[PDB]
Design a protein around this ligand. Structure first.
Ligand SMILES: CCCCCCCCCCCCCCCCCC(=O)OC[C@H](COP(=O)(O)O)OC(=O)CCCCCCCCCCCCCCCCC
Ligand SMILES: CCCCCCCCCCCCCCCCCC(=O)OC[C@H](COP(=O)(O)O)OC(=O)CCCCCCCCCCCCCCCCC
Ligand SMILES: CCCCCCCCCCCCCCCCCC(=O)OC[C@H](COP(=O)(O)O)OC(=O)CCCCCCCCCCCCCCCCC
Ligand SMILES: CCCCCCCCCCCCCCCCCC(=O)OC[C@H](COP(=O)(O)O)OC(=O)CCCCCCCCCCCCCCCCC
Lengths: 239, 239
């Protein structure tokens, strides 16, 4: 009926005008997340675990591989050396729930080199039909990711899973107008003028953007189940 | 050896001086958490689930029940109508890891009434030994909780569980100098001058503080295992 009045209670009791209130810097979060990301990156063996799974993804998606190509395979992978900057955090009425729900809008900007080495073979018809050409390693890269991210912690039941719950979730999503800049080149440098190098670059860019839009871009949300932060002794540690 | 230099990389790349940098307001977080807390409170049946578990706790702790008491039992329970305000968020070198780890120090202030109704019986020796007196309902309350909270997201392995892992955790803890103000009274109001009403109040205050210090207060941390926020289709929803 009129939950929203209940909804304001929140705003009034947390000193958030929600219009007048200025945006907030979020820098401490940049730092904590940066710390976990550097931890994540310092496990060297991890990249192999990642490359294995990315090749699993490609195997599952093999039928979507263009006809001129015999095979694609990730051989090397760069996870970068820079961190994602979150900024400009605004609370707004989620657009649009008729004031039922509150969400945070956040700016995100990542300037780094993330790269994949891709061993590539062509599907030729000479001398025999269905001949796999000699391999050629192509490095494909992302060099900037800028986006806007709405976040909230809800119970769901207002949102239905697309392709195959009780509890509380982190709901997040990106506005469809995101910037994701790619860059493409041969591994060798004498191979740089080969015909299919940009073809590969654009394939990969396409797929990555498609994966992304299918999972995180409005009107699609990620719904990630949260644990209780209630103090329990089985979670107690010291040092 | 000198990871810390690796540690600075973070600070330099996230524009955090860590000394000069000012504290940050955190209000959006107050709002999101307030939203989940109001959601948590709008399930009416939930309080019964809570009271059941609190009576389970008391059953487990029954041997610690003072001699003059026959039995204690929670009958009613108030979860409050106000929200916890987080503020003043500083990033600091965790004290002290020799610069290895970074944590956030946060102020927290809750002004609310949280209450429990406790049906209480005395253990008497007249007429017979081990006689349970008539019951009396005592309401015990917390009316302010002010504390300082260090938080970080680590991998552990530097911290060992006290009383009965691989992955990444939310680590949080409170400084030992916390404010937790209690208040105590009879349910009826003609029963207000009964001898054992403050005795009960102080028992409950003691136990609650003890539970708290045993779980969240330095040098003890809560270590809560986090899920991957990596976009996977089994987590994708829409509306
Ligand atoms: C990250 C910066 C803040 C540091 C985190 C310290 C804890 C802050 C959150 C405190 C909110 C008070 C709610 C605690 C009492 C209920 C806890 C609970 O049952 O969890 C329910 C709910 C789900 O638990 P379950 O369904 O009962 O298993 O979880 C949450 O409320 C998550 C709270 C947000 C914490 C993530 C912060 C990032
Ligand atoms: C004076 C009475 C005040 C009212 C206290 C309850 C109302 C507020 C607390 C919310 C409901 C508490 C029970 C919810 C948890 C499910 C039941 C359960 O687990 O009990 C078994 C649990 C034992 O499980 P075990 O630890 O695994 O052995 O026992 C308790 O949790 C007893 C809790 C005593 C009352 C808590 C006092 C609340 C202090 C408020 C400030 C604390 C900040 C802590 C930070 C939280 C976020 C970081
Ligand atoms: C809450 C406000 C921010 C909105 C949240 C949107 C996502 C922000 C975090 C993005 C950080 C980039 C790391 C994502 C790529 C690795 C993800 C992963 O594997 O999780 C590892 C790790 C554990 O995953 P596992 O051990 O591989 O299962 O989880 C995290 O890194 C948690 C990241 C913090 C998210 C909580 C924010 C509150
Ligand atoms: C051009 C090449 C750029 C390099 C791309 C990888 C380097 C950065 C990504 C980090 C490592 C990626 C794999 C880690 C996940 C484990 C493997 C896996 O799950 O694959 C199976 C997974 C399929 O699992 P399913 O969704 O359950 O079917 O497939 C993928 O995840 C493919 C990912 C394509 C490459 C991602 C492009 C990175 C964009 C960076 C900005 C995206 C922001 C997203 C927000 C994150 C935090 C909120």
């Amino acid at each position: 009926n009129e939950r929203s009045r209940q909804i304001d209670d929140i705003l009034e009791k947390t000193y958030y005008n929600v219009d007048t209130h200025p945006a907030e810097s979020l820098d401490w979060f940049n730092v904590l997340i940066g710390q976990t990301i550097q931890q994540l990156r310092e496990e060297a063996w991890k990249k192999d675990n990642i490359v294995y799974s990315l090749n699993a993804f490609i195997e599952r998606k093999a039928q979507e591989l263009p006809s001129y190509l015999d095979s694609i395979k990730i051989t090397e992978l760069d996870i970068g050396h820079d961190f994602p900057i979150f900024s400009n955090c605004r609370i707004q009425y989620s657009p649009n729930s008729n004031g039922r729900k509150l969400e945070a809008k956040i700016d995100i900007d990542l300037n780094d080199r993330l790269a994949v080495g891709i061993e590539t073979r062509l599907l030729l018809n000479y001398p025999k039909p269905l001949t796999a050409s000699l391999p050629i390693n192509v490095t494909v890269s992302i060099i900037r990711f800028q986006a806007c991210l709405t976040v909230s912690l809800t119970k769901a039941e207002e949102f239905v899973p697309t392709s195959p719950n009780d509890g509380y979730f982190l709901m997040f999503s990106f506005a469809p107008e995101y910037r994701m800049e790619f860059e493409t080149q041969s591994l060798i440098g004498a191979r740089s003028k080969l015909e299919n190098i940009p073809k590969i670059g654009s394939l990969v860019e396409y797929q990555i953007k498609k994966w992304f839009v299918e999972r995180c871009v409005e009107p699609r949300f990620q719904f990630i189940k949260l644990p209780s932060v209630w103090p329990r002794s089985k979670n107690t540690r010291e040092g």
